């Protein structure tokens, strides 16, 4: 029941992200931050460069 | 406690950064924080007041959120918001005031009200933010355990004290020797008088001394020290020590000789200044000791010689003095000073609502009484109460 | 107006957060806001000046944005920016100054200059933001019609007044009774004198009273009250009330008896203190009333007895006094105080540019004259003018 | 240098915005900035101290980053952070202090310590951010060359000076004429005395004048000017100019006649006030000139006439005076004042660590000595040292 605006988008910025600062609900809300800002961990040495 | 704080910088950085015009990307990081709050709230019932002439109002919530769409803020957006803030304003006021009255004794440094005891709850912690308000900055560092600190202008460290000590006196009070002073706020004035002008004194010099013990250590103090005590440079009729009669003081002022100011900490001299008038720094001290002398002038013109005869009656009373003012300093404990409104806010809210005298604070939050017996309980309560006053002043002045 | 504000916190939070180094992400929410401005501007013509020693400079716009998106700000980025800010700086100055000299009785709490009358325009409203500057915070709350509020250390509420009132006098002025005082800024000193030392007075006590009516209510005032008026504790030769001759005042000071200070609001006692010296709180008042007495000493040593004969000539004049200083307070109306530079800024800009006397403010922005007849028009103009001075000081000091 | 700044607002806007609760979004723009730092650091070694009673400590860097991963900060997140900040805190302290002691003539302005000389390095500049701290705001503008500016309260512009000048005197010192004064901090009190009460003076008027030359120009000064010099209104026994004897001063005060205060800049009158007591504005000046007169009362009651005979002995000494206090002002150069703790911080750190007297500053950072010979080198060193003290006070008070 969140339609109202089937979501209008225009490219550039992060169309997933924006959903984060959007609606509220915790379960839903953690997914967003964990997925959105989820990246790779840049790691060096591993028993030699 | 920390909870409370946010609730405000929330509103200020709100009722301020949210006006007809600005683009959305000026508050995106803000809007969010805000909403988060609303949620946590709605559903929880509160109650405030009850003591003295303080109303008892009930609060309920189920307020809507805020559109995170519109690019530019249209007037219509504001008003539908201000109307929702004005319930939190009129709320917080009634909240601060409620916990700005109760006092404990032991563990009286913590929350008391049925309003706040529920705030420290865990489910509410989801609000903290931007703790750049000098006071909260210091509340935290203390909770954990660290070296706190505040900034004061003309601090209020000296309980009012205006008196004298006669080191040599007699019933007629016609040949006295002693000191009289006024310690109040951030200032000390002290005069040493010798009716005989040291006529029979060794080296024709009379030594004087004035010691003032602070109830709290002051650090990084900028101090003005000047010769002479204007307050004790005029003719006076004073009550005798026993209150049975009155004596006459008719001063004539001479420069204080061998002036030495010592700022001590636990009996140790931390700073010492010899005859240095003007601006001096006392970096850490709990005691001030002023020593000065009256030296009979070795050479006197006739007019001067006439004031100081070899025999009584002594009609012109030789007087030397000093004036010391603490312009600014840092204290690890909260204190009243000449710029902050904390003491006045707390005292004013209590007076306006006819709050009954409690077990911790002296009647009327009397500063002299408070600083004279500045117990740990009074300090913890004062800090709690001052921190709340500062949270309140971010929104209501 | 609110427009104006932004234009600054824009630049400050700009010329400050934009330096060789920092990442873009430290100003993303900032850059944006900025650009938005440039757009709205570009194309519109301006004019400032036309009065006394104020140049008439014209300003045309035609500037581009800031698309250079590089992770870290390279020096080259700054300079190409600072050069664009230095036109807005040198601009705003010429803008503030222009509306900081024009006054209006038909109402001055509004835009006057051909520069600003165009700013309040609607198409410009697309700019406001971060209103945490104490003064704007208060401008808004006012134009919406509601309780305001400001902070002052040693406020300037008392117009200068130094005079006396002889309650008993005679041609020779050898047996006077009355009071003399100095009301100035945040301080009051008042002395009550009775040449006869209450020799024929009921209960050998002479009553004194000093009333001071503030032009604006002060709330949350922290006040120092001390016995004695040092200013009136020394020998003086004074002009008679009619200016025809001069009288001699030769004071000898006694402690003020039955001291009672009342802080009244609309005739009602809000705070009352009986003989309490040191720090006291007056939470809301428009009037201060100081009552004190001179009580002839019932017991006197010979030296004292000699000063107070049963018959004239009365050569030592019994005097009692009080000193009251408002260290800090809150006022709903703008006022000059001992810390803020607003009055000095406004007065200085007008003096430097030889601005002619207008219909609202007294010549030279004279504080005493202003506060003595602090009309609604003077207050609205003062607030407008003080708020602009505060906007200017964010960039130009 | 600018480097240094960031290192702090980094931590404050950190140890403040980062606590058990807040939602990520209020710090996304923050977290980033932070990390950036850590990187640049790790690997580099530092040398802090090595002078006087100053501990020489080494510092290595090898720390992790931050968990952008979580949503609402969990307690565990804080602690693992605070533990990493407390190394930077205890660090910076040891850094400020190290460069808050060294001095050099030639190139006194620039950095000196083996700690900072390495900071101005290029590979570090990647750190600057939020330069709204009044002091840095001014440091920058100075390295670019512009109308800088600072704000003060009861500023400390007058080196202590308490003396007199006898314009008419004789061995017996029974008929003197001259002035005596006290210039100290932000205040001036000056009295003009004429033992003869202008009995043989043209128009029975004796002219007086007191000139005070500031070592730095003050602009936008709010000043209190009052008639009378209370400090010189009481009986005194003073040393003669040659120190060979002592004279008697027995003042009786009259209103200063034809008072004229001039605030001059480079010999030009910028502001002039004729007999205006209360609050006055002096917008730009490097010199204050106070002119006032003693006019023998043309009409005298018997009591007054008796004080002023046609022939010696002159026993009551006619005195007129003025009191001037600079409440607030702006100066382009750093100065000590009654509110800021900078001077006290610098002086205190040097005293605590037994720092040896150097080639620039007077022993003990003595204010009077410093302002009396306020050379360019002392000012550049003072500004560097005051700016560092202000950076330090953002974290450590
Ligand atoms: Zn002050």
From Swiss-Prot, chains B, C, D:
Query: Which residues does the annotation say bind Zn(2+)?
Result: 153
Q: Which family does it belong to?
A: Belongs to the rotavirus VP6 family.
Q: Which cysteines are joined by disulfide bonds?
A: none
Subunit details: Homotrimer. Interacts with the inner capsid protein VP2. Interacts with the outer capsid glycoprotein VP7. Interacts with the outer capsid protein VP5*.
UniProt binding sites for Ca(2+):
266, 286
Where can this protein be found?
Virion
Do you know which InterPro entries this protein is assigned to? Capsid_hemagglutn (IPR008980), Rotavirus_A/C_VP6 (IPR001385), Virus_capsid_a-hlx_vir (IPR008935)
Q: What does it do?
A: Intermediate capsid protein that self assembles to form an icosahedral capsid with a T=13 symmetry, which consists of 230 trimers of VP6, with channels at each of its five-fold vertices. This capsid constitutes the middle concentric layer of the viral mature particle. The innermost VP2 capsid and the intermediate VP6 capsid remain intact following cell entry to protect the dsRNA from degradation and to prevent unfavorable antiviral responses in the host cell during all the replication cycle of the virus.
Q: Predominant location of this chain?
A: virion
Task: Write one Gene Ontology MF term.
Answer: host cell surface receptor binding
Miscellaneous: The VP6 trimer contains a zinc ion located at the center of the molecule. The zinc ion is not essential for either trimerization or transcription activity of the DLP. Zinc-depleted VP6 has an increased sensitivity to proteases.
Q: What is this protein called?
A: Intermediate capsid protein VP6
A single GO BP term for this record reads: fusion of virus membrane with host plasma membrane
Instruction: List every stretch annotated Interaction with the inner capsid protein VP2.
Output: 62-73
- Under the cellular component aspect of Gene Ontology, which terms does the record hold? viral envelope; viral intermediate capsid
Entry keyword Metal-binding: yes
Keyword annotations for this protein, in alphabetical order, are: Calcium, Capsid protein, Intermediate capsid protein, Metal-binding, Ubl conjugation, Virion, Zinc
User: Superkingdom of this entry's organism?
Assistant: Viruses
Q: How is it modified after translation?
A: The N-terminus is blocked.
């Amino acid at each position: 029941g969140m339609q109202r605006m089937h979501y209008r988008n225009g490219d550039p910025q992060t169309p997933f992200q924006i959903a984060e600062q959007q609606i509220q609900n915790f379960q839903v809300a953690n997914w967003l931050h964990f997925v959105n800002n989820n990246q790779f961990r840049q790691v060096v040495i591993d028993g030699v460069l | 406690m920390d909870v409370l704080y946010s609730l405000s910088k929330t509103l200020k950085d709100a009722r301020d950064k949210i006006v007809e015009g600005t683009l959305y990307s000026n508050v995106s990081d803000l809007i969010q924080q805000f909403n988060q709050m609303i949620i946590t709230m709605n559903g929880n019932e509160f109650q405030t007041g009850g003591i003295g002439n303080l109303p008892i109002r009930n609060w309920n919530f189920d307020f809507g959120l805020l559109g995170t769409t519109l690019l530019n803020l249209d007037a219509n957006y504001v008003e539908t918001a201000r109307n929702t803030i004005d319930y939190f304003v009129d709320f917080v006021d009634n909240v601060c005031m409620d916990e700005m009255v109760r006092e404990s004794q032991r563990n009286g440094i913590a929350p008391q009200s049925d309003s706040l005891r529920k705030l420290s709850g865990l489910k509410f912690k989801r609000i903290n933010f931007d703790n750049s308000s000098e006071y909260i900055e210091n509340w935290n560092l203390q909770n954990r355990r660290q070296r706190t600190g505040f900034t004061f202008h003309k601090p209020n460290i000296f309980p009012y004290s205006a008196s004298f000590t006669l080191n040599r006196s007699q019933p007629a009070h016609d040949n006295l020797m002693g000191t009289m002073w006024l310690n109040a706020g951030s200032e000390i004035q002290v005069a040493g008088f010798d009716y005989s002008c040291a006529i029979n004194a060794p080296a024709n010099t009379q030594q004087f001394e004035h010691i003032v013990q602070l109830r709290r250590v002051l650090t990084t103090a900028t101090i003005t020290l000047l010769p002479d005590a204007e307050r004790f440079s005029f003719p006076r009729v004073i009550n005798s020590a026993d209150g049975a009669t009155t004596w006459y003081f008719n001063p004539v002022i001479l420069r204080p000789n061998n002036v030495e100011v010592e700022f001590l900490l636990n009996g140790q001299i931390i700073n010492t200044y010899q005859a240095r008038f003007g601006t001096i720094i006392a970096r850490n001290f709990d005691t001030i000791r002023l020593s000065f002398q009256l030296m009979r002038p070795p050479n006197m013109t006739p007019a001067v010689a006439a004031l100081f005869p070899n025999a009584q009656p002594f009609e012109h009373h030789a007087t030397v003095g000093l004036t010391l003012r603490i312009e600014s300093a840092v204290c690890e404990s909260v204190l009243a000073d000449a710029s902050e409104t904390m003491l006045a806010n707390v005292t004013s809210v209590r007076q306006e609502y006819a709050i009954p005298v409690g077990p911790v604070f002296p009647p009327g939050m009397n500063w002299t009484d408070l600083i004279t017996n500045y117990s740990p309980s009074r300090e913890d309560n004062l800090q709690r109460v001052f921190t709340v006053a500062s949270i309140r002043s971010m929104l209501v002045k």
